[PDB]
Amino acid sequence: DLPQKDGSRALVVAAIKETEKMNFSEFLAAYEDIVARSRKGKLTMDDYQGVTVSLTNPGGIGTRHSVPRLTKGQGTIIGVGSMDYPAEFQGASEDRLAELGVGKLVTITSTYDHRVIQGAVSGEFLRTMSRLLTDDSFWDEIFDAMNVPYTPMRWAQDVPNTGVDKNTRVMQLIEAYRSRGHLIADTNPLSWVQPGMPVPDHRD
Amino acid sequence: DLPQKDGSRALVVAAIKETEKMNFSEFLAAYEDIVARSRKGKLTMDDYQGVTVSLTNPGGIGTRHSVPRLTKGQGTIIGVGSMDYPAEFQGASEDRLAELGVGKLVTITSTYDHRVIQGAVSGEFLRTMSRLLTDDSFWDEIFDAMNVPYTPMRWAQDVPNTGVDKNTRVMQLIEAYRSRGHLIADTNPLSWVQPGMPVPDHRD
Secondary structure, eight states: OEEOSSSOEEOOOOOOOOGGGOOHHHHHHHHHHHHHHHHTTOOOGGGGSOOOSEEEOGGGTTOSOOOOOOOTTOSEEEEEOOOSOOGGGTTSOHHHHHHHTOOOOOOEEEEEOTTTOOHHHHHHHHHHHHHHTTOHHHHHHHHHHHTOOSOOOOOOOOOOSOSSOHHHHHHHHHHHHHHHGGGGOSOOSSOOOOSSSOOOOOOO | OEEOSSSOEEOOOOOOOOGGGOOHHHHHHHHHHHHHHHHTTOOOGGGGSOOOSEEEOGGGTTOSOOOOOOOTTOSEEEEEOOOSOOGGGTTSOHHHHHHHTOOOOOOEEEEEOTTTOOHHHHHHHHHHHHHHTTOHHHHHHHHHHHTOOSOOOOOOOOOOSOSSOHHHHHHHHHHHHHHHGGGGOSOOSSOOOOSSSOOOOOOO
16 A cells, blocks of 8 residues: 555555565565565556465454455455454453463455356365464474574463473473573584584473 | 289389490390390399389370379489370371371470479479480481481471472472482492592582
């Protein structure tokens, strides 16, 4: 969305091209190029031509979901809604929500041309997006690209406070870092691991 | 108490002599000598002469305390009563007593000749006996004599289950023994410590 000389807002769609040949680092650079040039009025005619698929974000303002229109030339448009708690939880305590294990959600929509795309394909597409945003391999690939030294947080169900108390478990974590934490420390100025030597276990 | 040929029981007092020159090991030997010889009828006239102070045990049967008689020649007689719970707790659960922190008690009496011993002396005597049976130095001396390798249990008040939970504290004790327990193990066939070398800390 770029404002005009008069003042009236007018949305136009610009394209990130050849996206099937990019890693996350390359993708992030390409994205921020389009946003940069738009803010200083340096987009050309070629930037607005050749779009295959589109993305919209009603969730910015706080809309829960939308049913948008599809422009001629394309097959699908994807929409991203709000990342808040549901309205039935918007007056509850942080303490009570933390006890139960209530998370935030995002709603995603797919609007498609029925002459060329069938409903089973559209459902399978949204199922793959759901799996990726909770998948170990997906978050490993992003961390690798951005040079984050730690292991990513993994997806799991909340466990009950039975057997060994959770306070005992937090004290055992403090001992582990004080004893074995040097095994994952940013000590090597090269990104080098000697292939001959054996790697110690650091699951602790 | 030795039974006669007829069957009728008849108590007589035998003496452990020169007791002010003995350690606990020597004392235990002298005691068991008198008890042994009595059971096989080999006490002499000299064993029954020269008693200065006496000890009686009504607590054996379960009496709580007694006011006994003093025989001519001596100045005091000491009596030891029952080592049970009080009668008001004799129908309570082991669980409820353990929660509160209720211990067992022993009652001790002193019967003295008032022409030579005053009441203040008799009270000070019973206060010293109370202190000794809870004292660190007393139990160190007994353990040393009998060759017990561990430190004795010490006297303390029950502490509340606040701050770090007691379950966390029991798990830290298991880790201590698995790591540092070799420092107090029965590994040396001599009772030898090299005086030159420094002794490691094993308070853990």
